[PDB]
Design a protein around this ligand. Sequence first.
Ligand SMILES: CCCCCCCCCCCCO[C@@H]1O[C@H](CO)[C@@H](O[C@H]2O[C@H](CO)[C@@H](O)[C@H](O)[C@H]2O)[C@H](O)[C@H]1O
Ligand SMILES: COCCOCCOCCOc1ccc(C(C)(C)CC(C)(C)C)cc1
Ligand SMILES: COCCOCCOCCOc1ccc(C(C)(C)CC(C)(C)C)cc1
Ligand SMILES: COCCOCCOCCOc1ccc(C(C)(C)CC(C)(C)C)cc1
Lengths: 68, 60, 56, 97, 53
Amino acid sequence: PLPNAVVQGYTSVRGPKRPLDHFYGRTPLNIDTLWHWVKFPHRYDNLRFAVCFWAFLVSAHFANKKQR
Amino acid sequence: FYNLYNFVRIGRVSKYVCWLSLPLVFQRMWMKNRATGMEYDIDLENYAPFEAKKNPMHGH
Amino acid sequence: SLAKVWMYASWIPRGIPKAMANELSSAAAALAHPEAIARVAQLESQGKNPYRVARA
Amino acid sequence: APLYPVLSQASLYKRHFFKNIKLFHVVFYVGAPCVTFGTAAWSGSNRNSREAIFMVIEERHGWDNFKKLSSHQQGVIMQEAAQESLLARNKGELHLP
Amino acid sequence: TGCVASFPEGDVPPGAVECLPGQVIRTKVNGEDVMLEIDEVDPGYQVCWFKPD
Ligand SMILES: CCCCCCCCCCCCO[C@@H]1O[C@H](CO)[C@@H](O[C@H]2O[C@H](CO)[C@@H](O)[C@H](O)[C@H]2O)[C@H](O)[C@H]1O
Ligand SMILES: COCCOCCOCCOc1ccc(C(C)(C)CC(C)(C)C)cc1
Ligand SMILES: COCCOCCOCCOc1ccc(C(C)(C)CC(C)(C)C)cc1
Ligand SMILES: COCCOCCOCCOc1ccc(C(C)(C)CC(C)(C)C)cc1
């Protein structure tokens, strides 16, 4: 279906690929290495519960007053 | 509250039944807000007002 | 002082859920198995959120 | 004694984040929000149900009168129109030409 | 499992299950299934069940 050149990636000679840099002494920085810096929110979860309650309540209050 | 709920812990039937009347509270909470702004026909409200005074069809 | 003014102004807002909050806390202390409460205290001593742990 | 503007280690560390992308890292990561919130699933469904809704409204009630009504009754009539169109009682319940 | 220990009053170690007066404990003592009811823990002291963890 396809010639061997397309599969192996070269017609005659296999060219050397420059390897990937590492940046010794620190973590890799890639699109997939970002969870090292940004975990899921874990610090303000209970504050999230409180603020969700208060937001619901205040919205309901002002909406009911407006409607009435 | 800890005393009351420590006694609720010791019950057998009420601790699994007396809560089933509580959804009804939220039913009222929701229906009241539905009714606070419900749009209605002026003609039916003027012809058939609910529990309005001086309606001769009621008697007074 | 201004702190007293803020206290007397936020008293009525702050206290609307305190009843239900204390009710839930006390009902948890009463109805929940004490081993679960001890595990919660342990996990909070370990810096973890035991609610997220339980959900997971 | 380099005569060129030598680039710091941290600047290269940051540029590597941008140039070390692979094809799949773009394709799938951008296709998931795209396929979900695109002309297929969400944006398409919304924006194509709106057309039928307002066709039904302007045929049955009128756009000006609809504008005069409340947001609640607006939504009620919009939902009725969406149901009328999804049903497609005249097309034999078939969304084809 | 674990152990029951007496230690001075104050802060409870996190993970220990307090065993206050009135606490009932189903255990096995010398092959005998028993209930232990705590009564009159001494002052300046408290008792807790410490699992191995
Ligand atoms: C089967 C019925 C008849 C139809 C036959 C033809 C079908 C063609 C469709 C399949 C195409 C697959 O296409 C595939 O693309 C990749 C790109 O990642 C090529 O990949 C090639 O190039 C890359 C770089 O670009 C090289 O590093 C790699 O070594 C080499 O394999 C494959 O050689 C080719 O096979
Ligand atoms: C809208 O999205 C914003 C995109 O921009 C992201 C901004 O990123 C800058 C982050 O800045 C730093 C720099 C260093 C760090 C350190 C190295 C201190 C984090 C560490 C110690 C956890 C590794 C954290 C954040
Ligand atoms: C989903 O992710 C969205 C937000 O992600 C932000 C990621 O930010 C990470 C930034 O990476 C760094 C970290 C540290 C650094 C410094 C310069 C602080 C490192 C140093 C001091 C070792 C050179 C630079 C870039
Ligand atoms: C029958 O085949 C079905 C599979 O087809 C899936 C289509 O995927 C779309 C593109 O997917 C990719 C993604 C990355 C790549 C590689 C990893 C080869 C990219 C490269 C060359 C940058 C490393 C190849 C194809």
